[PDB]
């Protein structure tokens, strides 16, 4: 899919944010949206075609593939990258609205966070952090962080137990670890950014 | 398909609309057209190929797949997103026409909704609301909001009853719930926007 | 295929046409070219692969698929949208030529249809109307407006009669009805536009 | 393939050519390059996959498909549209070179075909005409203008005679007739353009 | 693949090169990069799928297809078009560097090849010529300029000799001849260009 | 995938870097990102489909294909081209920040590496070199630089030993050698660039 919608929006916020916001925008840009279109989208290509279980009964393969995979991981990461990118837009909307109000009000005759922009900023960073830890918790709860080559399936209308074999488990586990460590360092960067901003705000 | 037709049209209306109109345009932009191209278009890929019923008779699979699915859900959502996006264009057309008439008439020597723009605005929001509830009612009438893995098919030229097995029911039900809740909060946002505008119009 | 050839041409005519011409250009833009790329192009994907007749003889399927379908409907609509879009270009060419001649002639020292532009306008609308009714008549003559799921085929080198089963008849009939009603309201809009223009031309 | 190479070149010649050159550029633009990307490129999709002959011998199908088709028609039309578009570029190159020489020479202190531009113009139109009739003659010599559904193949390593069945003969014959009549009216337009230009050149 | 990297680079050299350089850039533009994306990329589509040898042993087909084809021809032409396009970039780099040095040095208070630009020019043309004849020599050494329909394969783990049948030999031989004659006239154009430039350089 | 993210970033650094940095940016541009989209992405197309081992047991092919290939080479090169392109961005970020600070500070009333830019420059080149040699060492440790046509597989649930046959080993080994020699000359260029810069820095 095309990812040139947000760019004409995240570029405009890359004019009047702090340096930690700029480097977080840069890592979100170059390490997630770029990685998702390039290679990790190709690896999930032959998802259901190469999947195979050892039986002769018709239609058991679809049920076992369903029970193994509630969702593919790519659409999970896309929902994650949508939900971590909503709650920073309203900060841009608020500063754009108050800049418009400033340019309206001053003519009846820089950037400095004061008054309420601190509040919007900290609740935006808090929402980003809690969405991050929520998505990571859900991914650990459902899938874990390893994929075995052999799966045991125990669902109707198949007989008692069947064995199924995936396709490319190693590469997928590698990319799962990679997206995990990217999410981890993004959370750590947000935490140290909020810590530095609060320290400078109590220092001034 | 390409979705860069309307953008050169919905951008121009994102200059002189109210804030509720701006946030509704933003959610229609980022949560529907972006979601439709990215991931939910991929999941309906192997629609008819992976579909399978348990028989030996030729050609029964096409009839049972037809009787199960009158339309795919993606084309239904595309028709929905067309019909909720027509009746806001004529508001832009009317304000563009009267702005042209203003710029023609004033030289023979902002934005403020007065006279008839209230009427066009409220009938546009009313048409959007009734189209929304009509599409949601039709989707509840035909499909429901859950998909069973096993379907029973009872059509000629197949014998009496046959069983059919779909592909990925869980992920599709998840995305159905997701589009449902997006439509619900869009309707609620339109209702509270019209309520606020009528309250300010009787307040002034 | 790419549809960004005409746009740099139909945009230029969307500067100096009447309001009925503008709304006809808008409906031709948003309801045909947009609909053709998005969803109805996907539904004709597995056209010949899913087609199947009940025999054991090799090669009968191609002959029966040929006799059922002289052309696919999508290429028929593309030829229709080409032939309804040629005879409006020469109006733009004529007004561009006479505007160039005006800008050449005036310097040797708006828009108002006078002299011959009425003639070009009415013959353009007449050609559009007769091409519309010709294409609709041909589509009714060959295909009708419904598709049965079962077809009886009676051609060599197959034996006497064979039965064939299509793929997704319901969705295709829905989209056929949709393109029909779009063509109908386009013809009605052109007729009422010409009626209004002739009434204003005899009123003045 | 992408067809946005020549456009940044045929647009520049659509500033200082005659009206017959402009309408020939317009028909070459809208009726060939647009038609080739949109629909007629889709119809040649399942070219070799759906092709089938009635035997049990391995590998005969490739030899019979080769002997039936020296080239597909689409690549033949692409070579035709390249060879009819080369010998008009050097006219633009010559007028650009002499316009550069004019702008160099005049400062040491419109368009009017005089001197040698007549010669370049008539040899360009002559080369376009002879390439057109050469390509049409070759297409009539090899293929004819009709496709039978059944073909008889008589090549080693197949036994004596075999029968082969194509895919969609009717639609392909329709598009062959269409490209033929487009080429015919292009040749007639070039001839009447050269006739009018020579008549005006002997009239002056 | 996308070929809009070099264009923003070969366009800039199409401002200050000689006329033979301009026509060589034009033929390299319109007859190679355009031809490679359009049609000849489609013909190598079903490369390995339609390939077939007559045996019952598993896996022999991959070994015989490997021994027949060290590389496909398209990737060979892509490497050729990279290696004939590197050694002209440094000429642009040198003239850009010395133009920058001129614009730096003159303000401390056209194009004319003098001093060392002759040397860079002749070694660039020499490198282009020797790379051209090297690639053509290698292509004649490995493949020849004709493809038989039947191939005899003599490799382990297949038994003694097997026969293999290609797909579309005639069309591929046609395009091989076409790329050959394009390379030949490019080499001849470079030779006559260098001859004319040296003749004018000894004439002055 | 799209590779037009970094371009709007590596272009901006191609304004104020040294000549060795410019030619390294040029070779990274034209010989890696261009080569990866064009041809070497096509050759890894039928990766798992054409792979085949000689057995009758179900599902052994996926396990043997997994044990042969931990990752495909293309995604390995993509991770390499990401990790060699991160540690040059912060140099641009630092010079942009200090140029902004210069333009802020000077108004309270070229490029010359002094103070700390030397330090950032040498640690950037050092990080690029060590990442290059690390990736090359890992590729030599896992794969080697040759691919045999026949592989012996010794994993459960297959019986004792099985033989597997790849697809196109020769072309893949050629491209492996090609990417190897490109990486080698990139490392050598970085080394001689740092040597020249340190020699000029101790010369001044």
Q: What is the 3-state secondary structure of chain F?
A: CCCCCCHHHHCCCCCCCCHHHHHHHHHHHHHHHHHHHHCHHHHCCCCCCCCEECCCCCCHHHHHHHHHCCCCHHHHHHHHHHHCCHHHHHHHHHHHHHHHHHHHHCCCCCCCCCCCHHHHHHHHHHHHHHHHHHHHHHHHHHCCCCCCCEEEECCCCCCCCEEEECCCHHHHHHHHHHHHHHHHHHHHHHHHHHHHHHHHHHHC
Q: What is the DSSP string of A4-27?
A: -STHHHHTTTTTSS-HHHHHHHHH
Cα(E30)–Cα(A165) distance, integer angstroms: 50
Tell me the chain A residues in contact with residue F48 when contact means C-beta distances shorter than 8 Å: 46, 50, 167-168
Chain breaks in chain B (C to N over 2.5 A) after: 109
Look up residue A144 and give its two tokens: 């874990």
Q: What are phi and psi of D103, to 5 degrees?
A: -70, -20
Q: How many CA atoms lie within 13 A of C175 on its CB side?
A: 25
Rounded Cα distance, A114 and A130, in Å: 25
Q: How far apart are CA A162 and CA A154, in angstroms?
A: 7
Task: Evaluate whether E148 touches E169 at the Cβ level (below 8 Å).
Answer: yes
Q: Do B168 and A65 touch (CB under 8 A)?
A: yes
Q: Say which residue the tokens 């531009």 belong to.
A: D117
- Give which of E29, E4, A171 is closest to F37, Cα–Cα: E4
- The resolution of the experimental structure, rounded to one decimal in Å, is 4.0
End-to-end CA distance of chain C: 45
- CA A165, A168, A171, A172 dihedral sign is negative
CA torsion angle A117 A118 A121 A122 (round to 10) = -150
Q: Which of D18, D12, D6 is nearest to D121 (CA)?
A: D18
Question: What is the distance in angstroms between the Cα of C22 and the nearest Cα belonging to chain D?
Answer: 22
Which among B48, B69, B74 has the least Cβ separation from residue C50? Answer: B48
Whole-number Å distance between alpha carbons of E109 and B43: 69
Closest residue to B165, CB basis, from A6, A63, A82: A63
Say how far apart CA B193 and CA B23 lie, in whole Å: 10
Residue A162: count of CB within 10 angstroms of its CB: 19
Q: Which residues pair with A152 in a beta bridge?
A: A163
Q: How far is CA F14 from the centre of its chain?
A: 20
Name the residue of chain A whose CA is nearest to F49's CA.
Answer: A50
- Cα distance between residue F148 and residue F164, in whole Å: 10
C-alpha span between B181 and B176 (Å, rounded): 9
Q: Taking CB atoms and an 8 Å limit, are D86 and E30 in contact across chains?
A: yes
Closest by CA to E132, choosing from E67, E197, E194, is: E194
The DSSP line for chain C is: ----STHHHHTTTTTSS-HHHHHHHHHHIIIIIHHHHHTHHHHTTTTTTS-EES-SSTTHHHHHHHHH-SS-HHHHHHHHHHHTTGGGHHHHHHHHHHHHHHHHHTT-------TTHHHHHHHHHHHHHHHHHHHHHHHHHHT-S---SEEEE--TTS-S-EEEE-S-HHHHHHHHHHHHHHHHHHHHHHHHHHHHHHHHHHH-
In this complex, the residue of E40, E52, E168 whose CB is nearest that of residue D66 is: E168
Length in residues, chain A: 204
Facing A170 at nearest CB: one of F1, F70, F74: F70
CB atoms within 10 A of CB D127: 16
Cβ pair C1:D26 closer than 8 A: no
C-beta separation of E175 from E72 below 8 A: no
Please report residues of E whose CB lies closer than 8 A to that of F162: none
At C202, list the tokens. 């005899």
Cβ neighbours of A104 in B, within 8 Å: none
Separation between Cα atoms, residue C51 and residue C60, nearest integer Å: 12
Kindly state the helix (H) or strand (E) to which residue B174 belongs, with its residue range. Answer: helix B169-203
HSE-up of E105 (CA within 13 Å, CB side)? 6
**Substitution target from D62, D143, D155 for chain E, most E beta carbons within 10 A:** D62
The number of C-beta contacts closer than 8 angstroms across A and B is 68
Helix (H) or strand (E) holding D176: helix D169-203
Q: Are D149 and D165 in contact (CB under 8 A)?
A: yes
Residue F197: name the closest of F90, F122, F98, F93 by CA. F122
- CB contact under 8 Å between D5 and E54, yes or no, is no
Report yes or no: C161 and C154 within 8 Å, Cβ to Cβ. Answer: yes
Counting CB pairs under 8 A, whether chains A and E reach 3 or more, is no
Q: Which of D82, D74, F42 is nearest to E35 (CA)?
A: D82
Instruction: Give me the torsion for CA of B39, B44, B45, B47, rounded to 10°.
Output: 170
CA–CA gap between residue A158 and residue A63 (Å, rounded):
8
Greatest pairwise CA separation for chain E in angstroms: 85
E86 DSSP assignment? G
Residue E164 parent element (H or E):
strand E162-165
- Strand order across the beta sheet in which B162-165 lies: B52-53, B162-165, B150-153
**From CA B122, how far away is CA B194, in angstroms rounded?**
7
Q: What is the spatial distance between Cα B98 and Cα B116, in angstroms, rounded to a whole number?
A: 11
Out of A3, A30, A39, whose CB is closest to F78?
A: A39
- The yes-or-no reply on A/C contact (3 CB pairs or more, < 8 Å) is no
CATH architecture for the domain at A6-203: Up-down Bundle (1.20)
Rounded Cα distance between A45 and A40, Å, is: 9
A169 neighbourhood in chain F, CB within 8 Å: 66
Gaps in chain E (C to N over 2.5 angstroms) fall after 109
> Which residues touch A158 (CB under 8 Å, ≥6 apart)?
A55, A57, A60, A63, A64
Residue A88 CB: number of other CB atoms within 10 A?
Answer: 21
Cβ of E78 and F33 within 8 Å? no
Strands E52-53 and E162-165: antiparallel
CB C165 within 8 A of CB B62: yes
Give, as one character, the DSSP assignment of residue E30. Answer: I
A162 contact partners, CB below 8 Å, separation of at least 6: A53, A54, A55, A60, A64, A152, A153, A154
Closest by Cβ to C59, choosing from D37, D54, D171? D54
Q: Do A75 and B171 touch (CB under 8 A)?
A: yes
- Tokens 């969609």, residue? D168
| F133, F81 Cβ separation under 8 angstroms | no
- Whether C34 sits inside 8 A of B5 (CB atoms) is yes
- The pair of structure tokens assigned to F163 is 């033989």
Residue A48 neighbours by CB under 8 Å, 6+ apart: A65, B46, B50, B167, B168
Both tokens of residue F131? 């990442």
Task: Dump the DSSP string for C53-94.
Answer: ES-SSTTHHHHHHHHH-SS-HHHHHHHHHHHTTGGGHHHHHH
Q: How far apart are alpha carbons B34 and B32 in whole angstroms?
A: 5
Q: Preceding residues of all breaks in chain D (C to N beyond 2.5 angstroms)?
A: 109
Rounded (10°) CA dihedral B17, B23, B24, B30: 130
In terms of residues, how long is chain B?
204
CA distance F163 to D135: 53
Nearest Cβ partner of C62 from D26, D50, D174?
D50
Say whether the peptide bond before residue C157 is cis (omega within 30 degrees of 0): yes
Residue B50: its chain A contacts at CB < 8 A? 48, 62
Question: What gap in Å lies between CA A47 and CA C98, rounded to an integer?
Answer: 61
Backbone torsion region of residue F13, taken as left when φ is above 0, otherwise alpha when ψ lies between -120 and 50, otherwise beta? alpha
Q: How far apart are CA E47 and CA E72, in angstroms?
A: 9
Angle, CA of E87, E91 and E94, to the nearest 5°: 135
In whole angstroms, give the CA distance from residue C91 to residue C81: 17
Chain A residues near residue F13 by CB distance under 8 angstroms: none
Alpha-carbon torsion (F120, F121, F125, F128), positive or negative: positive
Whole-number Å distance between alpha carbons of D109 and E56 = 86
Nearest to E13 by CA among E22, E4, E5, E24: E22
Helix pair A73-83, A117-142: axis angle to 10 deg:
170
* CB contact set of D90 (below 8 Å; sequence gap of 6+): D120, D124
How were these coordinates obtained? cryo-EM
Buried b / exposed e over B11-23, threshold 16 CB at 10 Å, is eebeeebeebbee
Task: Report the alpha-carbon distance of residue A13 to residue A32 in Å, rounded.
Answer: 18
B186 within 8 A of B24, measured Cβ to Cβ? yes
Tokens found for residue A133: 């830890």
Looking at chain C, which subunits does it touch, using at least 3 CB pairs closer than 8 Å as the criterion?
B, D
CB contact under 8 A, B165 and A59: yes
For residue D127, CA distances in Å to D87, D130, D134, F144 come to: 7, 5, 10, 57
Provide the residue ranges of all domains of chain A, joining segments of one domain with +: 6-203
| Concatenated DSSP letters of D117-162 | HHHHHHHHHHHHHHHHHHHHHHHHHHT-S---SEEEE--TTS-S-E
How far apart CA F31 and CA F38 sit, in angstroms, is: 11
Please confirm whether the linkage preceding A157 is cis (ω < 30° from 0).
yes
Pairing of strands D162-165, D52-53: antiparallel
With an 8 Å Cβ cutoff, the interface of chain C facing chain D consists of 1-3, 5-6, 48-49, 58-59, 62-63, 65-66, 69-72, 74-75, 78, 82, 86, 89, 93, 97, 157
Helices E73-83 + E117-142 axis angle, to 10 = 170
Distance CA F88, CA C58 (A): 63
Q: Cα(E66)–Cα(E151) distance, rounded to whole angstroms?
A: 12
Q: Do B130 and B80 contact (CB within 8 A), yes or no?
A: no
Instruction: Report the relative pairing of strands F150-153 and F162-165 from DSSP bridges.
Output: antiparallel
Chain center to CA of D32: 8
Residues C15, C21, C22, C26: what is their CA dihedral angle, to the nearest 10 degrees?
-130
Q: How far is CA F47 from CA F51, F62, F117, F147, in A?
A: 7, 12, 46, 14
Of E190, E20, E33, nearest in space to D93 by CA: E20
The whole-angstrom distance between residue E37's C-alpha and the CA centroid of its chain comes to 14
Q: Which residue of B has its CA nearest to A66?
A: B168
Q: CB D170 to CB C71 under 8 A?
A: yes
CB of F65 closer than 8 Å to CB of F48: yes
How many H helices and E strands in chain E? Answer: 9, 3
User: Taking CA atoms, what residue in E is nearest to F52?
Assistant: E59
CA dihedral sign of residues F26, F28, F32, F34: negative
F149·E6 Cβ contact <8 A: no
- From chain E, pick out residues whose CB is under 8 angstroms from the CB of F38: 1, 3, 78
Exposure of E52 in the CB half-sphere (CA atoms within 13 A): 14
What is the spatial distance between Cα F175 and Cα F177, in angstroms, rounded to a whole number? Answer: 5
The values of phi and psi at residue F153, to 5°, are -115, 135
The chains found to touch D (3+ Cβ pairs under 8 angstroms) are C, E
Q: CA of A57 to nearest chain B CA: how many angstroms apart?
A: 9
Query: Rounded CA gap, C62 and D148, in Å?
Result: 13
Q: CB of D70 within 8 A of CB of E171?
A: yes
Chains that touch B (3 or more CB pairs under 8 A): A, C
Residues of chain A positioned with their CB less than 8 A from the CB of B29: 5
């Amino acid at each position: 899919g095309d990812w040139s919608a947000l760019g004409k929006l995240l570029d405009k916020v890359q004019a009047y944010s702090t340096a930690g916001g700029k480097v977080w925008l840069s890592v979100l840009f170059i390490f997630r949206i770029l990685l998702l279109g390039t290679a990790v989208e190709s690896a999930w290509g032959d998802e259901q075609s190469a999947f195979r279980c050892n039986t002769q009964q018709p239609g058991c393969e679809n049920v076992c593939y369903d029970k193994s995979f509630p969702i593919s991981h790519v659409r999970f990461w896309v929902l994650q990258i949508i939900f971590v990118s909503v709650p920073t837009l309203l900060y841009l909307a608020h500063v754009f609205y108050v800049m418009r109000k400033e340019e309206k009000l001053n003519k009846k005759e820089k950037v400095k966070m004061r008054g309420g922009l601190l509040r919007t900023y900290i609740i935006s960073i808090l929402f980003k952090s809690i969405f991050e830890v929520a998505f990571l918790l859900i991914q650990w709860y459902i899938y874990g962080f390893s994929l075995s080559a052999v799966y045991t399936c125990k669902r109707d209308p198949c007989p008692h137990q069947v064995d199924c074999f995936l396709s490319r488990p190693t590469e997928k586990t590698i990319f799962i670890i990679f997206m995990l460590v990217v999410s981890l360092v993004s959370l750590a960067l947000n935490i140290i950014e909020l810590f530095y901003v609060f320290f400078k705000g109590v220092k001034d």
